Amino acid sequence: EAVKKWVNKIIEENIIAVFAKTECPYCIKAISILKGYNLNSHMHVENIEKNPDMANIQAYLKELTGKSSVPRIFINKDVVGGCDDLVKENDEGKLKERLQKLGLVN
Ligand SMILES: [Cl-]
Ligand SMILES: [Cl-]
């Protein structure tokens, strides 16, 4: 229960929620893309490797999204997925439309 509540709070309190780990190039790329849309004020990045319950967090992220790998990316509680998913949404215009609907970009 405790791990799930903790993960939920991160996703609920932050419009943009990224679960990451230490020295993870696709985490860094995803976060940089997101920071490039000036989202920092509504972004939270959680390093789940520096955590005693990493495996439990990963298992719950898999229950929520289908994958246990990081990065895992949520926007307004909606599952974006990983960095590749973000790149697809970014290149095809879905990401900006997401952010426009949230008032995060003009
Ligand atoms: Cl996914
Ligand atoms: Cl994926």
Side-chain angles (χ1 to χ4, degrees), residues 2-8 10-49 51-105:
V3 169
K4 287 190 175 183
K5 301 169 168 160
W6 180 90
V7 171
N8 287 351
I10 292 165
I11 300 173
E12 292 154 8
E13 292 178 8
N14 305 284
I15 295 173
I16 312 284
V18 181
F19 297 86
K21 75 183 187 155
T22 308
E23 311 177 342
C24 161
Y26 286 102
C27 301
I28 296 162
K29 184 191 179 82
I31 291 161
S32 185
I33 287 175
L34 289 163
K35 285 193 174 187
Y37 274 94
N38 198 42
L39 307 179
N40 198 69
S41 64
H42 289 283
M43 280 183 82
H44 184 61
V45 176
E46 186 73 35
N47 181 340
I48 68 172
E49 179 172 8
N51 192 296
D53 304 315
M54 181 187 193
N56 310 98
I57 298 161
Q58 280 182 270
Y60 182 43
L61 292 171
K62 187 173 189 178
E63 290 175 10
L64 291 181
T65 73
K67 302 232 180 315
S68 56
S69 53
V70 290
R72 298 276 92 209
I73 301 161
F74 301 80
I75 295 186
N76 195 34
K77 287 170 292 196
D78 195 25
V79 175
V80 169
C83 183
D84 294 354
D85 295 316
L86 186 70
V87 166
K88 179 179 176 57
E89 287 201 13
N90 193 34
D91 289 5
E92 293 174 355
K94 168 68 165 298
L95 181 50
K96 185 197 257 226
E97 182 173 320
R98 254 191 220 277
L99 301 168
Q100 281 171 335
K101 301 332 209 265
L102 299 167
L104 291 171
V105 299

